[PDB]
Each structure stands twice: as structure tokens, then as C-alpha cells.
């Protein structure tokens, strides 16, 4: 039997959010540590994996590895539910056919259940994160948010280029072309919007518009966001929760 | 304790037929959403993937996680007993020193129960897929099987070769050369003879026909083999059952 | 509840001491057919990768995976504590906030307990391995240990060279240089002592002194160390238990 209370159900909706423009379907694996999920997109360059510790729940309990398959349209239709501060908790059973969603609120007024549909989904687990990568650097979501936000605008294509305290970011389209570059620094005013890179082998990689904006959705979920680059693999951008992680490992292009 | 029952046994013989000309040895590891198991050959060139989840099951419990290691030669031994369309219990404790395999029949005259000794296998699974493959098609597990076995006649080594709506599998060797071109469509009288392609990036690789052979045996398991090409990582073939597949992940070979 | 017995404390306290000049922090996931814990050092070109069954304890309980982070040195610092021939039992509760560390000698004279507080580790476990290396080697733990040591003194930067029966070890620096070249062979005056090479590509590699230092610790545990390199991926340094393994993951150098 599965019983997970969240403290604000904001956070699961934010998070259910956090990759909507969405990788749709996903296994939702619910064990005694905690809860895991990932899922791929339909043209499966874009994986999205997230880990929910035990810390980040008011309370938890599970005593048995239970998945959980679900549409994310019907759980965001149904995440859409209440006052977006209440006592969240997940119940299921030992062979749940059926996931429940329960808020309560400040008093108890207002008891709200909600009864979502599981289904089966087959999901080899994938296990593509490296050791190590060409480049890492991480910086405030929001300016990335930004850049990639404006970029956007030129070209369907953005270059990320990073070289010695160097990260370029680049767009070129039919209207014309931009290109922001930033450089390392130590913030000590507040050290929340410092910007760090780490290099061990300059880069040139270029990613679809289309996707990073999916990307940048969860900068609602973190200060920072952290990238790790390299052309042997897939890039990964990571959000950090309280206790757990939302990522997304994304493909660059070829040509 | 486990209990799982299979409909029919001739599901699970078969199954351990679609890799025999084996991977000799194998770790079979049950849990409460079902089987997965893995191993690769002395070669260490094919590594082969199983997943079996409940549904697939007449019935099935387990409740806590367990480990069987146990020689293929003798399970399909022991598999070779019954009328082949028995019921079939895997039957195994907390801590087995052995595996119970037992096969019951319309009425219950004929109960056999055999006793198959467990063995201790060191082995790190291995989570070798990737994200994207440079390639990505379908067809009839009979075709590909045909494909295969016309051309293994002539070289110990098939070529296949992906190219824009064009898929050419060739072999090369001393009497003579052989290609057989296929085309892909949406075969609307049924579309289970249909031949799907999907090209991120055009493909020559060269696998070894021994190995092959072996994949080409799952076809009786699956109406379509799903084949995934890269030339960064090991060639993907999959056949799909009701709820899981098996999956065999091979090498090419470089010159 | 974890219960765990270890025979000989030398045993677990040598295996600590297998990563020691440490990878700092690492998650212990406890679980019912074993123990499993990997981690990475700070500049993340090394992972530590080990696996202890069931078989490798004189006692052995848990029926509820247990995560278990704990820093090194104050383990090692605890580890410090005995006859180094006791018996060791570790203990855990449910939901550990801290793990139990009891020493038993031969009689009942002096029993020692110690509880080391627990940590929060968050970490994606990494599944870095592959199916095929380009080439394969074994050796005696203490030959590869001496050529490591050796080769160190002249540079910070051990290039490893393989070619048909051929194995080079080579230091270049700013004294001089050194090279020690083995060749693989059958003692059959004692197979211990043996050397064996399978190449199916040539490969010459690079690494950082300062890790292979660190690898060579693991020659406590086992009388063969076994080596995997590839071009494609971090090079694989194995030491073998009774029932389980030490490994080490660790990265060439570009240029």
C-alpha cells in the first residue's frame, strides 16, 4: 500500500508541469526510498527522468515497489483541483488498478478525492547519464530561461558553443541572428546568481528550439539550473528539489 | 515466496528457445511487477534482454524480490516434459537452494513436478541502450528470419545497409555475393506484413551471421521484429510479447 | 531491519580501505540478495563501483532495501576498532537515522558497539559499463600494483599500450622515461601468476597517475586484478571477491 503527503500540492503540480509540453505517458516507479520517473517524447530525443526523495514529502510510506502508469494530461486535469495549497496525499494499494489523489485543506471543510486510471506501459529503464562530461556550468534559471526565450525567436536551431571561461550562445535564422555570451563569475552580493563553468574540452553543439523551451519549464522548481555538455552524448540540463532532482537528457543535431 | 503460473507452457519453452543456441547461464530476476533477466555469450559480442511482465502471466505472486541462476540446457531439459499446453508454476521460497517447476493438465491425472538446482551468478546487468539510434525500422519476423538465412548461405558476414526509404542487407564472401533491397509501406490489406523505416542518418553496418542466427530465432514469439541501428552502439533487434520482449543488443564488427 | 555478519571485520575494513584516497561520501544500497554501493570523486573521471553477496557474509538479513550514506573516513575512523578478526554484525532499523557497528571477539569478554550517524546522499547510480571493450587483460594484482608504483615516480601520466600479444606500460617526465612491456602466457607451475590478453582492437591510452595509485589499493582483495580498455568509454579495473567484486571506472586523458 502506497500513502505519499505532500505538504503543498503545488510542488507535485509544479512538477507534473515541469515537463508538460510533454513527454506524453509516464511510469511513475514508487519504492521504499522514494519515487522515480522517466519518459521519452514521441521522436525520443528528449528524455525526461525525475527522482522524488522521501525528504521532499510532508510524510511516506510504501513498504512494497508499487509502478504507476498514467496519462499526463488526466493527471494535470485532475492536478488542476484545489486550492494549490492543500495536503496532497497518493494512496494505492498492493495491486492498484486505480491511483487515488487526496486533498485536504486548512480545516476541513473542503475534502477533495480523486480516483485517476492507471494503465500498463512497458519501459526498458534507460540508463544513458555519463561519468564524465566535456563541459559543466550552471547558472540562474531564469537568464537561461531568457536567453533561450529570446534566441528562440531568430532560429529553430540554437548553438551552444563553450570554450575557456567562454559560453556562447548563439541563434541564426532567416530574419537574421543573435548571440549571448556570458562569462564566469563569483557573485558574493548573493551567490544565487552566479554563474560557474567548468571545462575540460571545448564544445560546439547545436539543439532544437523546440526542446529547450520544454526544457526551460522547469525553471519553476529551481534557482539553478545545471548543464553538462558533451558530443559523445546527450546534454543534460538538471533542475534540484529539495531532496531529489528533475533532468532532462536532450540530443544534439548532426547536421 | 514465488508463484507464477503460466496459461501455457509452451510460452516459456519457447521463450528460452528464442535464445538458445545460447547465451549459456542466465540470472533471472523476479520481483513484484514481474521477470526481467539478462546475459551475454563467452564472446561477450550479443547480450540478450528479457522482460516478462504480469500480465503476460496466467497468474503470478512473489512479494519479495528473488535471484535464479540456473544452466538453459538443463531448464529446456526439463522443459522439454509435457503435453505443451500444460499449466506451468514456477514454484521457489525465501531463500531457494532450488526452483520448483510444476506442469498440470486439463483434468489431474498427470501431475509432474520437477526440481531444478539453483546456482550463484555474479553478473552486473547491463543498461547499454541508448536514447537515439541512428536508425529505426520494422518488418516480419519471417521476412528478416528468410533474409538472414538466404544470406548467411554465402559469407559468415551480412552487411545491412540504410539509406533515405531504402534498407539493403547484403552478403559478400568466396562462391558468390547476395543482396536482398526492401522498401518501406503501409500494407493496407494487412498491416501486419508492412515494412516501417524511420532515418535520422544513414547506416552501414557489418554484424557476424553466427549471431544473427541466433536473433533471427525469436521469430516465433513475435509477428514483427523491430530493428534499431547506430554505429556509436551495439544494434538493437526486438520482438515484443503480450507484456514485455525480448531483446537482443549485438556488436558489429569494425574491419 | 538490516543484519549483516561479517565473518572477519578485516574483510569489510580492507574493502573500505580498497577506496580509500578516497572517493568522499558513498550511498551502501542494502537490499535482499546483497549489498551494492558506487560513488564518484570531485573531479568525477573516477567511479567506484561495488557488489558484495550474500554468499561473502557469515550472515546475512534485511527483507527491506536500505540506503546507507556515510562519510569514509569516519567509517574507516570506526573500522579502526577491533581485534581486525572479530565478528562484525551491521545492524539498521527501518528508517535508519543512524547504522550500528558490532564487534564480537572470541569469547564474550569484550563487546564493542558503535553507532555512526547516517547521512542524505542523493545520487543517480550510474551504469556506465558496456558490453564490449576493445581489449581484455588479467594479471596479478601485485605485478600491476609494482609497474604502477614504478612508473609513477618518472610522470603524472601512465600511457597504456596494447597490440597483439603485447601489453606496454609507458611513463614519459621530465627525469627521463620508463616502459615495462609484458606478454601474455600459461604458468602452469602455478596459474596464479599467469598473464592473459584477449585484443580485438589495438588501444593506447592514457591516465592519470594520481588514479591509478588509487585503483592499485584494490590488490588487498584479490590475487588477479582484471583490466578492460576501450577508446569509446572509461576504462574498467576489476578486483574479484568470493561472491561480488571492487571495480573501478576511470577516464583516459584527450590530450
Given at each position: 500500500?502506497?500513502?505519499a503527503?505532500?505538504?503543498?500540492?503545488?510542488?507535485?503540480?509544479?512538477?507534473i508541469?515541469?515537463?508538460?509540453?510533454?513527454?506524453?505517458?509516464?511510469?511513475?516507479?514508487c519504492?521504499?526510498?522514494?519515487?522515480?520517473?522517466?519518459?521519452?517524447?514521441?521522436?525520443?530525443?528528449?528524455?525526461?527522468s525525475?527522482?522524488?526523495?522521501?525528504?521532499?514529502?510532508?510524510?511516506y510510506?510504501?513498504?512494497h515497489?508499487?509502478?504507476?502508469?498514467?496519462?499526463?494530461?488526466?493527471?494535470?486535469?485532475?492536478?488542476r483541483?484545489?486550492?494549490?495549497?492543500?495536503?496532497?496525499?497518493?494512496?494505492?494499494?498492493?495491486?492498484?488498478?486505480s491511483?487515488?489523489?487526496?486533498?485536504?485543506?486548512?480545516?476541513?471543510?473542503?475534502?477533495?478525492?480523486?480516483?485517476?486510471?492507471?494503465?500498463?506501459?512497458?519501459?526498458?529503464?534507460?540508463?544513458?547519464?555519463?561519468?564524465?562530461?566535456?563541459?559543466?556550468?550552471?547558472l540562474?534559471?531564469?537568464?537561461?530561461?531568457?536567453?533561450?526565450?529570446?534566441?528562440?525567436?531568430?532560429?529553430?536551431?540554437?548553438?551552444?558553443?563553450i570554450?575557456?571561461?567562454?559560453?556562447?550562445?548563439?541563434?541564426?535564422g532567416?530574419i537574421?541572428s543573435?548571440?549571448?555570451?556570458?562569462?564566469?563569475?563569483?557573485?558574493?552580493?548573493?551567490?544565487?546568481?552566479?554563474?560557474?563553468?567548468?571545462?575540460?574540452?571545448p564544445?560546439?553543439?547545436?539543439?532544437?528550439?523546440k526542446?529547450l523551451?520544454?526544457?526551460?519549464?522547469?525553471?519553476?522548481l529551481?534557482?539553478?539550473?545545471?548543464?553538462?555538455l558533451?558530443?559523445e552524448?546527450?546534454?543534460?540540463?538538471?533542475?534540484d528539489?529539495?531532496?531529489?532532482?528533475?533532468?532532462?537528457?536532450?540530443?544534439?543535431?548532426?547536421?
Amino acid at each position: 500500500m502506497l500513502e505519499a503527503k505532500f505538504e503543498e500540492a503545488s510542488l507535485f503540480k509544479r512538477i507534473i508541469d515541469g515537463f508538460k509540453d510533454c513527454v506524453q505517458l509516464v511510469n511513475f516507479q514508487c519504492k521504499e526510498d522514494g519515487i522515480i520517473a522517466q519518459a521519452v517524447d514521441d521522436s525520443r530525443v528528449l528524455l525526461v527522468s525525475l527522482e522524488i526523495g522521501v525528504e521532499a514529502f510532508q510524510e511516506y510510506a510504501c513498504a512494497h515497489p508499487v509502478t504507476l502508469g498514467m496519462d499526463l494530461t488526466s493527471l494535470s486535469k485532475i492536478l488542476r483541483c484545489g486550492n494549490n495549497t492543500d495536503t496532497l496525499t497518493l494512496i494505492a494499494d498492493n495491486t492498484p488498478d486505480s491511483i487515488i489523489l487526496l486533498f485536504e485543506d486548512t480545516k476541513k471543510d473542503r475534502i477533495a478525492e480523486y480516483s485517476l486510471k492507471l494503465m500498463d506501459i512497458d519501459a526498458d529503464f534507460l540508463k544513458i547519464e555519463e561519468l564524465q562530461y566535456d563541459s559543466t556550468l550552471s547558472l540562474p534559471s531564469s537568464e537561461f530561461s531568457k536567453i533561450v526565450r529570446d534566441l528562440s525567436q531568430l532560429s529553430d536551431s540554437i548553438n551552444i558553443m563553450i570554450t575557456k571561461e567562454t559560453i556562447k550562445f548563439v541563434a541564426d535564422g532567416d530574419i537574421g541572428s543573435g548571440s549571448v555570451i556570458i562569462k564566469p563569475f563569483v557573485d558574493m552580493e548573493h551567490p544565487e546568481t552566479s554563474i560557474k563553468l567548468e571545462m575540460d574540452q571545448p564544445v560546439d553543439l547545436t539543439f532544437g528550439a523546440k526542446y529547450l523551451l520544454d526544457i526551460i519549464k522547469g525553471s519553476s522548481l529551481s534557482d539553478r539550473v545545471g548543464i553538462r555538455l558533451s558530443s559523445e552524448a546527450p546534454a543534460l540540463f538538471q533542475f534540484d528539489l529539495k531532496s531529489g532532482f528533475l533532468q532532462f537528457f536532450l540530443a544534439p543535431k548532426f547536421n
